[PDB]
C-alpha cells in the first residue's frame, strides 16, 4: 500500500501564510504520506517545508514566482530521475513535473501540474490536459504512472479533450464517485477567499494507469480551521491510498 496527498496550498494568498504553512505541515505529519503533490508553492514556503517537513525530499517544478512540488518520504521512496515538460502557451508559468522513483519493488512515474486557471482559459487548459494524458501513455509498460494535481477542470471539459485514454482512470470515479470527498474546492464550507455565494468543484483529481494497482480509499484533509479563523488553504487536501495486487 502506497499513500499520497495532492494539495493546492494557496501560496498566492499572503494573509496568514506563515500560520497556514504550519497548518499544512501539521496535516502532513498526521497522515505521513509516502508522497506529497503540492501546487501554488512559493520560495519562502519551500524553505519552510525544508526544515519543518525534513523527512521529505523536495523536487520543485521551478525556482521563481510560484510552482508545483513533489515530496518523497526519505527511506521509503527513492529518487531516480526527474523531467520537466513545459506548456509552450501557458501564461501562468504552468508546466508538467515528472519524477521517476522506486517505492517497494515497483517503479513509479509521479506527475503533477497546475493547469491554467479560470473559465476563460478553458481552451489552453484542455490543450494542457492532452499533453499530460499523452505523457502518461509514453511511459514504459514496466512503470506505474500516477498523476495528481490541480486540474481546474469543470463543466465536463474532459470530453472535449477526447476523454481519458482507455488505459487511464480517475481515482475518484474508479471508487464509484464517493460523495464525502466529491468536491475539493467549496466556498460554502471554505471562507478563505471571502465569497458570499456557494461554488463547488472537483478541481483536484488523480489519474493513474495500470490491473497492476488499484485505489483503496479517498479522503479530504485540511478540514480544521486554524487560530486565525481560516483554513490552511482554499482547497481541501486529497488523501489517496493505492494498493498493489500480488
Ligand atoms: N484571478 C482570479 N479571478 C477569478 N477567479 C479566480 C482568480 N484566481 C483564481 N480564481 C478562482 C477560479 C478557480 O476556480 C478558483 C481556484 O483556482 P485555482 O487556480 O485552482 O487555485 O479560484
Ligand atoms: Mg489558488
Q: What angle do CA 170, 176, 182 make, to 5 degrees?
A: 75
Nearest Cα to 201, choosing from 172, 162, 230, 241?
A: 172
Binding-site entries: 10, 40
Tell me the CA end-to-end span of the chain in Å, nearest whole number: 11
Strand 2-8 relative to strand 35-41: parallel, antiparallel, unpaired? Answer: parallel
Give the ligand 1 atom nearest the CA of 40.
Answer: 21
Instruction: Kindly state the helix (H) or strand (E) to which residue 47 belongs, with its residue range.
Output: helix 43-52
**Which residue is closest in CA terms to ligand 1's atom 3?**
118
Q: Hey, is 185 helix, strand or coil?
A: strand
| C-alpha span between 111 and 151 (Å, rounded) | 12
Q: How far is the CA of 27 from the centre of ligand 1 (A)?
A: 23
| C-alpha span between 203 and 205 (Å, rounded) | 6
Beta-ladder partners of 70 = 37, 59
Q: What class has domain 1-246?
A: alpha beta
| C-alpha span between 83 and 139 (Å, rounded) | 12
Residue 225 φ then ψ, to 5°: -60, 145
Beta-ladder partners of 242 = 2, 215
Quote the cell numbers at residue 114: 497546475
Q: How far is the CA of 8 from the centre of ligand 2 (A)?
A: 7
Amino acid at each position: 500500500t502506497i499513500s499520497f496527498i495532492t494539495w493546492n496550498i494557496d501560496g498566492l494568498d499572503g494573509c496568514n501564510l506563515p500560520e497556514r504553512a504550519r497548518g499544512v505541515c501539521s496535516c502532513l505529519a498526521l497522515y505521513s504520506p509516502d508522497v506529497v503533490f503540492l501546487q501554488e508553492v512559493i520560495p519562502p514556503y519551500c524553505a519552510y517545508l525544508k526544515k519543518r517537513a525534513a523527512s521529505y525530499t523536495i523536487i520543485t517544478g521551478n525556482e521563481e514566482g510560484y510552482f508545483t512540488a513533489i515530496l518523497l518520504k526519505k527511506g521509503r521512496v527513492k529518487f531516480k530521475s526527474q523531467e520537466i515538460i513545459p506548456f509552450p502557451n501557458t501564461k501562468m508559468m504552468r508546466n508538467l513535473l515528472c519524477v521517476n522513483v522506486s517505492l517497494g519493488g515497483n517503479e513509479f512515474c509521479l506527475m503533477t501540474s497546475h493547469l491554467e486557471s479560470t473559465r476563460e482559459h478553458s481552451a489552453e487548459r484542455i490543450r494542457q490536459l492532452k499533453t499530460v494524458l499523452g505523457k502518461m501513455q509514453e511511459a514504459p509498460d514496466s512503470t506505474t504512472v500516477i498523476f495528481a494535481g490541480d486540474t481546474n477542470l469543470r463543466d465536463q471539459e474532459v470530453i472535449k479533450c477526447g476523454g481519458l485514454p482507455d488505459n487511464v482512470f480517475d481515482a475518484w470515479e474508479f471508487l464509484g464517485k464517493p460523495k464525502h470527498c466529491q468536491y475539493t474546492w467549496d466556498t460554502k464550507a471554505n471562507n478563505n477567499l471571502r465569497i458570499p455565494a456557494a461554488y463547488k468543484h472537483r478541481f483536484d483529481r488523480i489519474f493513474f494507469r495500470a490491473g497492476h494497482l488499484i485505489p483503496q480509499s479517498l479522503d479530504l484533509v485540511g478540514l480544521e480551521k486554524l487560530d486565525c479563523g481560516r483554513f490552511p488553504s482554499d482547497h481541501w487536501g486529497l488523501l489517496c491510498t493505492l494498493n498493489v495486487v500480488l
